[PDB]
C-alpha cells in the first residue's frame, strides 16, 4: 500500500534521526560507556539495534498490510515456504548489512567508499542498505550487500567442511 | 615533556648524573668528557592515556584534501565558517568520537568535545 | 584475502567467484578495468627536480620540518615544500600525454607524503574528470554535450575517440591507491544543487568538493553479471 | 583522599634509575590492586 | 539460426514472415511493433518470435 | 549471587569489583621519575603539602 | 541548436563508454600486456646479460608467424590450421651477435598472442577473418600450443618495494616488524627481504629494534646499521629516524637504541660487526669490512640504488621505516592492511613470459660459455627457449 510505504519511510527517517543524535551526543563526549564495553563500542551497539528496530517494524509493517489472498503470505501461513525476514526484505526494507558481526569498515583510510567523505558513521555510510528489493538497491547499497553475500558465501563452504570431518 | 639533549662536541646523547655533593642534576656524555647542569628535574615520562597524536596531520593545505568532510561551525577566534573536522588521528580502540576543526583561515584548531581538559593539541 | 574488499569497487566484481575452494580468489575484472603495462619512471624523476624537488642528500629534517616526502616506486628521492604546486603540474602533464596515463600520482596531505607509480601490474579504471569551474557557478563536470557528439559522430561513422578524451583531460585512469584521495560523485547530477513513492531512495550530494564521477556505476560488475537483468532486485548471493 | 590529586611517590633503599624504570614496569603490570587472575572483564546482567 | 518455422507455443505460422518483417522496417521505416502487429502477429508469443530471432545464418553464409 | 542478597544491584557491584581483575595499570594517568634529592622537601610545587605531612 | 558547453547526463555515460570499448575492446589487459612484451620487454632481457668471458648480443626481430614442416618445410601459418593440425602459432626470435677477443641468428620459437600485433589477424578485416575461417567475434588474447587454445590467468601477487608494518602474536618475542620486499624492473628479479623488528612486548624491559640482512646470520642493532652507513652520532641518527624535535616520546623509544649500539663508534667497526657475522673464524679483518660493504652496497634495499656513493639514501629510508614502525607501536597509526587492493599487483602474459625467458635465456647464455671455456681453439640450443615456452 501507498500508505504503508509512508510510514516505512518514515520508520526508517526515525531511524536515521536516532542514529543522528547519538552521533552528536558522542561527538561532544556525552556519551557514556558502560563497563568494559569502549565508547565507540557502546556507539556501534547502539546504532545496530536502532537500525535493526528499524528494518523489524518497518517489515511488520508490511506484513500487516498484505492480504489474505496474497500469495506470498498464503504461502508463509500455510508453512510451506518462507518467512517474515522475506516479506520484510522484499517489500520493506533490505536493512544492515555485516562483515564480520559489524557495520561495513572503513577499507579506504577512514572511509568505506571513495564516494563519502571521511569519518562518516552514518547508516549509509556503513552498510544498511534502506530499500527493498522491490525498490532496488543504490549502488553503494549493492556493493555493501555483496560484501555481506560473500561472507555467508564463505562462511558455507568452511560450515560445511568443518561439519562433515566432526561428522566422521 | 622530556627534552632531549646532546654532546655540543660529539653529538651523542647525553646521560643523568647526581653531583652527589652539592645535589644537583648533570647531563654527561659518554663518549666525551663533556657535561651541563640540567634544565628540568624530570627526567623520564611515561603517559598511560595520551593525547600525543590527535591532532597529526594539520597542515598548510589540509583544506585542499577533498575528502575532509566540511561543516559551516564558527571559530572562537576569526569567527569565520569555513572548517575541514576529522576525527581523533591516534589509532585506539578506545577513542573518543570527538571532532577536530581546522579554520581554513586563522589556522586555529578547535573541538566539539564538551568536556575538554585540552589548551593545545 | 577471501573476502570482498571495499577496494575492490570498480576493479573486480563484486558477483562472480566461484563456489567452494577458490570462492574469493578467483575474481574477474570489472568490464572497464585495465592494468598497467609499466612505464620508464626517468622523466618523471628528471622533471621532478627541476620543480623543486630537494634531494635526499641535501635534506636536513630539523630545518625544513614541514616538507613533502617524494617516492617513485618506492624509492624516496627527497623532499618538496610546496607539493601543492608540484602536484597542479603533474596533474596537468598527465591530463595532456606529457606523462603516461597509467601512471599514478597520490598526494597525502596529512601525512605529508607525495608518491607515484609507473610500474606494471597496478589495476585502475576510468572516471569523469569534474573541475571548477566554469565560470557557470558550480564544480561541473569537463565533458559537456559538445564532446559527446564529437562521440557519436564518429560511431556512426562506420574523428573523436577514447583517446581524445583522455588528451583532452576530460577522462583520466585511477587506480586503487590514488582512489583515496579523491572524492566521486556516483551520477552527474550530483553536481548539480515531491518525489517518485516508488523510486529507490538515494542519499544526496552532502558533497561540494568532488574531484571525479563515475562514467557509469553499472561498470563495477564483470562480464557475467553485466549479463543478469536487474541484479539490484537480487539477494547477493 | 580528599587531597585533590591523587600521588603515589617512591623512592628506592650507584647507577640507580633503572632499578626504577623496571620498577616501574612491575607497578604498572604485576601489582593485582583487586580481583581474581584471570578474571578481565565482569558484566551484570539482569 | 534462421526464422523459425512456427511459434514455439501456438503454432502459428512465422517462418513465411521474416522477410517481409524486415522490408516493413528498413523500406517503410515502421517501428517494430507496428511491423508485428501488421504481419497479423498479435500475441505475444507470435511477437516473441519474430522480434528477438537472430539470423545468424546471415553470418553462416559468409564463409568459403 | 547469595540467596538473600540476589536482586541488590549495589551488592552486585561489590561482586564486580572483588573479583574483576585490576591493576595499577588500569587506575594510572603517567608515571615520571624526577632528580628530587632532598627527601624533606620537593622540588614539585604540588606535593608541598604531603610531605607537609612527615 | 543544443549547448555544445552544456552539462551532460546519465544516457550520455553510455556514449563515453561505447567509446571506450570502440578502443580498447574487451580483452586489451591482455593484448597490451603481450604488446609490450614483444615491443620492450623482449629487448630488454637480452641487454642485462649481453656480454661474457668475449661475444655480445644487440637488436631482436620477430617474425610472424610459421612453422618448422615434415618435409616440403617452413611456412606462414595461420590460427585456424594451427588448432586443426596441433600446431603451435609460433614466431622465431633472431638476435645480432658479436664476436670480438677478450681472455641475422635464430634462438627460437615464441608463442604468440591472438590479436597482438605480430599476428595476422590484428590487422585484418572482416572479409579477411571470413577467408581465414576466424569468427569476427573471436577478440583473441590467448595462444594455440598444440593445437589447443590456452589462456593465462591473471596472478595476484603483493606489490614490492613497499614497507609494511605488522603486530606480532602474544607468546612472540618481537611485538612489531616492518618488512620490505626489495625488487627491480633493471638488474634481474632478485628479492631481498628487509625486516625491522621491535624487539620485548609492551613494556618489556629496553625494547629494541634490530634488522634482518640478508646472509648476516645474527639481528642487526639498527644503530649499528647507521654507523657502517656512515651516519655516525646518536644525534645525526635519530634525526634520519624522528623527522620532529618535540616528539619526545618516539626519541624516548629510541634510546634503548642508542644503548644497544653504544659500542660501536665508527664506521669501520660497524662493518666489521657485521662482516663478521657473516664470515667464519679465520677471515681477516679486511675482508670482513668489505664483505659488509658488498652486503649493504648491494643486498640491502637494493630497490633505491645498488652502486657506489648512495648511502644517504638508504639510511634516510632506513629511518623512515623505523619511523612506521614506531608510529604503530606508540597507537598513531593502525598496522597496514594486507587487503588492500592498490598494493596488489596482477601478473599477466608479459611478465609471465619474462620471467620465463629471462630464466631461460640465461641458461641459453650459459651454454654459450661452455662452447668456450671447453673451446682450446653458429653452434647454440634453440629449442632449450622454444620448448621451454611451449613446454
Ligand atoms: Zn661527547
Ligand atoms: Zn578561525
Ligand atoms: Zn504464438
Given at each position: 500500500?501507498?500508505?504503508?510505504?509512508?510510514?516505512?519511510?518514515?520508520?526508517?527517517?526515525?531511524?536515521?534521526?536516532?542514529?543522528?543524535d547519538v552521533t552528536k551526543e558522542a561527538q561532544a563526549n556525552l556519551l557514556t560507556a558502560k563497563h568494559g564495553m569502549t565508547l565507540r563500542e557502546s556507539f556501534e551497539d547502539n546504532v545496530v539495534r536502532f537500525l535493526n528496530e528499524a528494518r523489524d517494524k518497518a517489515g511488520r509493517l508490511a506484513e500487516v498490510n498484505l492480504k489474505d489472498l496474497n500469495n506470498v503470505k498464503q504461502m508463509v501461513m500455510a508453512g510451506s515456504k518462507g518467512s517474515f525476514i522475506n516479506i520484510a526484505q522484499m517489500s520493506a526494507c533490505v536493512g544492515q548489512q555485516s562483515v564480520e558481526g559489524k557495520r561495513i569498515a572503513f577499507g579506504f583510510v577512514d572511509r568505506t567508499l571513495p564516494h563519502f567523505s571521511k569519518d562518516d558513521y552514518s547508516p549509509e555510510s556503513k552498510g544498511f542498505v534502506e530499500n527493498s528489493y522491490l525498490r532496488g538497491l543504490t549502488p553503494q547499497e549493492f556493493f555493501f550487500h555483496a560484501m555481506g553475500g560473500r561472507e555467508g558465501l564463505i562462511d558455507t563452504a568452511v560450515k560445511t567442511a568443518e561439519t562433515g570431518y566432526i561428522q566422521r | 615533556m622530556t627534552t632531549f639533549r646532546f654532546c655540543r662536541d660529539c653529538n651523542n646523547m647525553l646521560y643523568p648524573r647526581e653531583d652527589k655533593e652539592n645535589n644537583r642534576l648533570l647531563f654527561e656524555c659518554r663518549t666525551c668528557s663533556y657535561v651541563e647542569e640540567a634544565g628540568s628535574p624530570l627526567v623520564y615520562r611515561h603517559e598511560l592515556i595520551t593525547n600525543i597524536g590527535e591532532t597529526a596531520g594539520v597542515v598548510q593545505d589540509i583544506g585542499s584534501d577533498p575528502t575532509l568532510p566540511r561543516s559551516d561551525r564558527e571559530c572562537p577566534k576569526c569567527h569565520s565558517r569555513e572548517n575541514v573536522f576529522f576525527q581523533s588521528q591516534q589509532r585506539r580502540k578506545d577513542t573518543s568520537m570527538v571532532l577536530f576543526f581546522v579554520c581554513l583561515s586563522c589556522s586555529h584548531i578547535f573541538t566539539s568535545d564538551q568536556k575538554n581538559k585540552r589548551t593545545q593539541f | 584475502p577471501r573476502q570482498l574488499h571495499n577496494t575492490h569497487w570498480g576493479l573486480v566484481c563484486p558477483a562472480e567467484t566461484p563456489e567452494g575452494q577458490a570462492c574469493g580468489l578467483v575474481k574477474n575484472l570489472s568490464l572497464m578495468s585495465c592494468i598497467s603495462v609499466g612505464t620508464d619512471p626517468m622523466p618523471i624523476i628528471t622533471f621532478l627536480s627541476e620543480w623543486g624537488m630537494e634531494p635526499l642528500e641535501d635534506y636536513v629534517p630539523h630545518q625544513s620540518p614541514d616538507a613533502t616526502r617524494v617516492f617513485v616506486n618506492g624509492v624516496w628521492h627527497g623532499v618538496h615544500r610546496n607539493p601543492a604546486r608540484?602536484?597542479?603540474?603533474?596533474?596537468?602533464?598527465?591530463?595532456?600525454?606529457?606523462?603516461?596515463?597509467?601512471?599514478?600520482?597520490?598526494?597525502?596531505?596529512?601525512?605529508?607524503?607525495?608518491?607515484?607509480?609507473?610500474?606494471?601490474?597496478?589495476?585502475?579504471?576510468?572516471?569523469?574528470?569534474?573541475?571548477?569551474?566554469?565560470?557557470?557557478?558550480?564544480?561541473?563536470?569537463?565533458?559537456?554535450?559538445?564532446?559527446?557528439?564529437?562521440?557519436?559522430?564518429?560511431?556512426?561513422?562506420?574523428?573523436?575517440?577514447?583517446?581524445?578524451?583522455?588528451?583532452?583531460?576530460?577522462?583520466?585512469?585511477?587506480?586503487?591507491?590514488?582512489?583515496?584521495?579523491?572524492?566521486?560523485?556516483?551520477?552527474?547530477?550530483?553536481?548539480?544543487?515531491?518525489?517518485?513513492?516508488?523510486?529507490?531512495?538515494?542519499?544526496?550530494?552532502?558533497?561540494?568538493?568532488?574531484?571525479?564521477?563515475?562514467?557509469?556505476?553499472?561498470?563495477?560488475?564483470?562480464?557475467?553479471?553485466?549479463?543478469?537483468?536487474?541484479?539490484?532486485?537480487?539477494?547477493?548471493? | 583522599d580528599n587531597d585533590e590529586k591523587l600521588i603515589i611517590r617512591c623512592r628506592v633503599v650507584a647507577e640507580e634509575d633503572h632499578m626504577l624504570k623496571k620498577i616501574e614496569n612491575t607497578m604498572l603490570e604485576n601489582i593485582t590492586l583487586r580481583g581474581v587472575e584471570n578474571i578481565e572483564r565482569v558484566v551484570m546482567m539482569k | 539460426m534462421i526464422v523459425p518455422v512456427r511459434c514455439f507455443s501456438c503454432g502459428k505460422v512465422v517462418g513465411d514472415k521474416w522477410e517481409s518483417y524486415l522490408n516493413l522496417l528498413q523500406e517503410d521505416e515502421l517501428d517494430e511493433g507496428t511491423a508485428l502487429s501488421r504481419l497479423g502477429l498479435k500475441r505475444y508469443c507470435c511477437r516473441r518470435m519474430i522480434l528477438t530471432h537472430v539470423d545468424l545464418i546471415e553470418k553462416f553464409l559468409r564463409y568459403n | 549471587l547469595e540467596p538473600g542478597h540476589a536482586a541488590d544491584q549495589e551488592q552486585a557491584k561489590l561482586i564486580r569489583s572483588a573479583i574483576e581483575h585490576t591493576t595499577l595499570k588500569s587506575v594510572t594517568i603517567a608515571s615520571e621519575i624526577y632528580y628530587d634529592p632532598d627527601p624533606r622537601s620537593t622540588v614539585i610545587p604540588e606535593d608541598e603539602e604531603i610531605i607537609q605531612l612527615h | 541548436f543544443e549547448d555544445e558547453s552544456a552539462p551532460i547526463t546519465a544516457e550520455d555515460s553510455w556514449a563515453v563508454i561505447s567509446a571506450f570499448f570502440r578502443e580498447k575492446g574487451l580483452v586489451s589487459q591482455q593484448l597490451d600486456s603481450f604488446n609490450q612484451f614483444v615491443d620492450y620487454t623482449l629487448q630488454d632481457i637480452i641487454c642485462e646479460d649481453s656480454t661474457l668471458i668475449e661475444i655480445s648480443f644487440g637488436k631482436?626481430?620477430?617474425?610472424?608467424?610459421?612453422?618448422?614442416?615434415?618435409?616440403?618445410?617452413?611456412?606462414?601459418?595461420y590460427p585456424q590450421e594451427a588448432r586443426l593440425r596441433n600446431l603451435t602459432y609460433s614466431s622465431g626470435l633472431f638476435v645480432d651477435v658479436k664476436k670480438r677477443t677478450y681472455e641475422k641468428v635464430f634462438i627460437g620459437r615464441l608463442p604468440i598472442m591472438l590479436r597482438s600485433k605480430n599476428c595476422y589477424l590484428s590487422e585484418a578485416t572482416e572479409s579477411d577473418l571470413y577467408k581465414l575461417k576466424e569468427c569476427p567475434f573471436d577478440m583473441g588474447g590467448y595462444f594455440i600450443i598444440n593445437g589447443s587454445e590456452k589462456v593465462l590467468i591473471a596472478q595476484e601477487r603483493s606489490a614490492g618495494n613497499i614497507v609494511q608494518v605488522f603486530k606480532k602474536a602474544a607468546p612472540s618475542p618481537i611485538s612489531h616488524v616492518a618488512e620490505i620486499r626489495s625488487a627491480l624492473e633493471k638488474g634481474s628479479r632478485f628479492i631481498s627481504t628487509l625486516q625491522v623488528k621491535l624487539y620485548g612486548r609492551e613494556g618489556s624491559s629496553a625494547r629494541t629494534i634490530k634488522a634482518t640482512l640478508p646472509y648476516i646470520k645474527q639481528d642487526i642493532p639498527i644503530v649499528i646499521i647507521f654507523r657502517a652507513?656512515?651516519?655516525?652520532?646518536?644525534?645525526?641518527?635519530?634525526?634520519?629516524?624522528?623527522?620532529?624535535?618535540?616528539?619526545?616520546?618516539?626519541?624516548?623509544?629510541?634510546?634503548?637504541?642508542?644503548?644497544?649500539?653504544?659500542?660501536?663508534?665508527?664506521?669501520?667497526?660497524?662493518?666489521?660487526?657485521?662482516?663478521?657475522?657473516?664470515?667464519?673464524?679465520?677471515?681477516?679483518?679486511?675482508?670482513?669490512?668489505?664483505?659488509?660493504?658488498?652486503?649493504?652496497?648491494?643486498?640491502?634495499?637494493?630497490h633505491i640504488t645498488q652502486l657506489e656513493g648512495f648511502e644517504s639514501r638508504k639510511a634516510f629510508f632506513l629511518g623512515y621505516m623505523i619511523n612506521r614502525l614506531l608510529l604503530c607501536a606508540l597507537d598513531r597509526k593502525d598496522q597496514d592492511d594486507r587487503d588492500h587492493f592498490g598494493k596488489k599487483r596482477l601478473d599477466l602474459a608479459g611478465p609471465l613470459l619474462a620471467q620465463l625467458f629471462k630464466t631461460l635465456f640465461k641458461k641459453l647464455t650459459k651454454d654459450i660459455f661452455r662452447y668456450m671455456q671447453r673451446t682450446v681453439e653458429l653452434a647454440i640450443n634453440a629449442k632449450t627457449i622454444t620448448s621451454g615456452l611451449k613446454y
Open positions: 500500500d501507498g500508505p504503508t510505504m509512508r510510514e516505512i519511510t518514515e520508520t526508517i527517517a526515525e531511524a536515521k534521526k536516532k542514529v543522528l | - | 608540484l602536484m597542479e603540474t603533474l596533474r596537468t602533464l598527465r591530463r595532456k600525454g606529457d606523462i603516461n596515463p597509467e601512471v599514478s600520482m597520490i598526494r597525502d596531505i596529512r601525512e605529508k607524503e607525495l608518491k607515484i607509480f609507473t610500474d606494471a601490474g597496478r589495476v585502475y579504471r576510468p572516471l569523469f574528470i569534474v573541475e571548477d569551474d566554469e565560470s557557470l557557478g558550480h564544480k561541473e563536470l569537463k565533458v559537456r554535450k559538445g564532446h559527446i557528439a564529437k562521440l557519436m559522430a564518429t560511431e556512426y561513422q562506420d574523428e573523436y575517440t577514447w583517446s581524445s578524451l583522455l588528451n583532452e583531460g576530460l577522462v583520466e585512469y585511477i587506480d586503487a591507491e590514488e582512489e583515496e584521495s579523491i572524492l566521486i560523485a556516483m551520477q552527474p547530477e550530483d553536481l548539480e544543487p515531491d518525489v517518485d513513492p516508488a523510486k529507490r531512495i538515494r542519499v544526496s550530494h552532502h558533497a561540494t568538493t568532488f574531484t571525479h564521477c563515475e562514467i557509469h556505476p553499472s561498470m563495477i560488475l564483470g562480464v557475467a553479471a553485466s549479463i543478469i537483468p536487474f541484479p539490484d532486485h537480487n539477494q547477493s548471493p | - | - | - | 631482436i626481430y620477430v617474425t610472424k608467424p610459421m612453422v618448422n614442416e615434415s618435409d616440403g618445410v617452413t611456412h606462414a601459418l652507513l656512515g651516519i655516525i652520532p646518536d644525534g645525526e641518527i635519530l634525526e634520519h629516524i624522528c623527522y620532529d624535535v618535540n616528539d619526545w616520546q618516539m626519541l624516548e623509544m629510541l634510546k634503548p637504541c642508542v644503548e644497544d649500539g653504544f659500542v660501536i663508534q665508527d664506521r669501520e667497526t660497524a662493518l666489521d660487526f657485521i662482516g663478521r657475522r657473516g664470515t667464519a673464524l679465520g677471515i681477516k679483518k679486511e675482508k670482513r669490512i668489505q664483505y659488509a660493504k658488498d652486503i649493504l652496497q648491494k643486498e640491502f634495499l637494493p
